Design an enzyme around this catalytic site. Structure first.
Site, short mmCIF file in Angstrom:
data_model
loop_
_atom_site.label_atom_id
_atom_site.label_comp_id
_atom_site.label_asym_id
_atom_site.label_seq_id
_atom_site.Cartn_x
_atom_site.Cartn_y
_atom_site.Cartn_z
CE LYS A 1 9.26 3.20 -16.86
NZ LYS A 1 8.61 3.27 -15.66
CB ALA B 1 -0.65 0.20 0.72
N1 NAP Z 1 5.96 5.12 -7.10
C1 NAP Z 1 6.14 5.88 -8.78
O1 NAP Z 1 4.92 6.34 -9.05
C2 NAP Z 1 6.26 4.90 -9.84
C3 NAP Z 1 6.01 4.72 -10.96
C4 NAP Z 1 6.98 4.39 -11.67
C5 NAP Z 1 6.99 2.41 -11.24
N2 NAP Z 1 6.69 2.47 -10.01
C6 NAP Z 1 7.86 0.78 -9.74
O2 NAP Z 1 7.15 0.60 -8.91
C7 NAP Z 1 7.21 0.16 -7.42
C8 NAP Z 1 6.65 0.41 -6.60
O3 NAP Z 1 6.61 2.05 -6.17
P1 NAP Z 1 5.84 2.89 -5.04
O4 NAP Z 1 6.68 4.31 -5.01
O5 NAP Z 1 4.61 2.33 -4.56
O6 NAP Z 1 7.31 2.55 -3.90
P2 NAP Z 1 7.11 3.07 -1.99
O7 NAP Z 1 5.45 3.91 -1.89
O8 NAP Z 1 7.75 2.41 -1.06
O9 NAP Z 1 5.14 1.75 -1.85
C9 NAP Z 1 5.76 0.00 -1.33
C10 NAP Z 1 4.99 -0.48 0.11
O10 NAP Z 1 5.12 -1.65 -0.22
C11 NAP Z 1 4.88 -2.28 1.29
N3 NAP Z 1 5.30 -3.05 1.15
C12 NAP Z 1 6.91 -4.18 1.02
N4 NAP Z 1 7.54 -4.38 1.31
C13 NAP Z 1 6.53 -5.38 1.77
C14 NAP Z 1 6.02 -6.59 2.56
N5 NAP Z 1 7.23 -8.15 2.86
N6 NAP Z 1 4.14 -6.80 2.71
C15 NAP Z 1 3.97 -5.81 2.73
N7 NAP Z 1 4.45 -4.67 2.21
C16 NAP Z 1 5.07 -4.28 1.99
C17 NAP Z 1 5.43 -0.75 1.93
O11 NAP Z 1 5.39 -0.59 3.12
P3 NAP Z 1 5.70 -0.25 3.96
O12 NAP Z 1 4.60 1.20 4.09
O13 NAP Z 1 5.84 -0.66 5.28
O14 NAP Z 1 7.56 0.65 3.22
C18 NAP Z 1 4.56 -0.01 1.00
O15 NAP Z 1 4.11 0.78 1.50
C19 NAP Z 1 8.78 0.26 -7.69
O16 NAP Z 1 9.62 -0.91 -8.23
C20 NAP Z 1 8.60 1.75 -8.23
O17 NAP Z 1 10.20 1.86 -9.02
C21 NAP Z 1 6.37 3.44 -9.30
#
Ligand code: NAP
Length: 303
Positions: free
Chosen positions: A182, A8
């Site tokens: 990408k 989340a």
């Molecule tokens: N964000 C963007 O705009 C974007 C755009 C393109 C691609 N992406 C890709 O999408 C992926 C996610 O990016 P994001 O920005 O959404 O990351 P983020 O903000 O760090 O969200 C990741 C989430 O996963 C949860 N998590 C991690 N390990 C877990 C586990 N073992 N059990 C349960 N929950 C777990 C984390 O919980 P905690 O809150 O406790 O840390 C966090 O809420 C990445 O690979 C990124 O490169 C992102």
């Protein structure tokens, strides 16, 4: 037909809000019971669009409890994907399908090997979202998500309910060609932005370096069977430079915030893939050696 959401975060909440608010069954999978109470005192996910905040009360749970998972969205970092999916491997049914939103390559194949009884679909998103609190996400910029499965090229019928939720997507027969496009885009820009401590527009002052990197990245793309991506790469890179000239790259923002970098699935994967073949990629190798030393110098992981 519940959409289970594991992770989340930025993309995870943005997907959960759009799926849940469109009347589709959605279930958040939070880390532990402590997070579940902190989520219930907040009342749901807060999405900020153009400054306007809205509260979406999406049902949540922990990994131990809940119903069998037939459709799971993995929306965590690439270096946490293996550990995340294994936490709910006991609830995966035999017909379960996983949507892997991780950036780069490497983690998706690791998840597929760890869960051989499930179908792992690959995704590549250009949507923008960031966190402003534990359960508050800003919809920073609209984008597109490509889907596909290298083993099973047939498109699932539930793509239509992604359209109903307002989630733009397209099914690609060759999803790996998208991810490699990408990835090579990320290698030519983001490492230099960290080493030079500059916005993406600042890479104009290093044109010889960009051309030398795109050359080795072009050889790596051709040896991988993606001829079209290797020819347009140098011009694809320069187009992204102008479009994001005022922005700081994602890897630059991670290092600035003292966070872990997805290097092991971006430049690290590219250098390892050329080694698995037989391509000498020296300039990509020294770029990797410098970026790893830059990360270690600040107490950050080099993988
Ligand atoms: N964000 C963007 O705009 C974007 C755009 C393109 C691609 N992406 C890709 O999408 C992926 C996610 O990016 P994001 O920005 O959404 O990351 P983020 O903000 O760090 O969200 C990741 C989430 O996963 C949860 N998590 C991690 N390990 C877990 C586990 N073992 N059990 C349960 N929950 C777990 C984390 O919980 P905690 O809150 O406790 O840390 C966090 O809420 C990445 O690979 C990124 O490169 C992102």
């Amino acid at each position: 037909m519940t959409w289970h959401i594991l992770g989340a975060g930025s993309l995870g909440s943005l997907w959960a809000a759009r799926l849940g608010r469109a009347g589709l069954p959605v279930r958040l999978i939070l880390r532990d019971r402590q997070r579940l109470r902190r989520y219930q005192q907040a009342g749901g996910l807060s999405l900020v669009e153009d400054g306007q905040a809205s509260l979406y009360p999406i049902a949540a749970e922990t990994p131990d409890g809940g119903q069998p998972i037939q459709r799971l969205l993995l929306a965590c970092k690439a270096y946490d994907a293996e550990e995340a999916a294994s936490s709910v491997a006991h609830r995966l049914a035999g017909n379960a399908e996983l949507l892997l939103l991780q950036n780069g390559l490497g983690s998706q194949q690791a998840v597929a090997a760890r869960l051989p009884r499930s179908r792992c679909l690959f995704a590549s998103s250009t949507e923008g979202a960031f966190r402003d609190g534990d359960f508050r996400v800003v919809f920073a910029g609209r984008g597109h998500t490509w889907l596909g499965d290298p083993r099973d090229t047939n498109a699932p019928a539930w793509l239509t309910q992604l359209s109903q939720a307002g989630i733009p997507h397209s099914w690609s027969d060759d999803i790996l060609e998208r991810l490699w496009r990408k990835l090579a885009l990320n290698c030519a820009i983001n490492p230099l932005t960290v080493l030079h401590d500059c916005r993406n527009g600042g890479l104009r002052q290093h044109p010889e370096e960009i051309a030398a990197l795109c050359d080795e990245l072009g050889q790596l793309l051709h040896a991988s069977g993606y001829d079209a991506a290797a020819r347009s790469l140098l011009e694809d890179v320069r187009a992204v430079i102008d479009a994001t000239a005022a922005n700081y790259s994602s890897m630059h923002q991670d290092v600035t915030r003292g966070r872990r970098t997805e290097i092991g699935y971006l430049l690290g994967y590219a250098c390892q893939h050329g080694q698995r073949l037989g391509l000498p990629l020296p300039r990509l190798g020294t770029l990797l050696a410098r970026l790893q030393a830059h990360l270690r110098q600040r107490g950050l992981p080099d993988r």
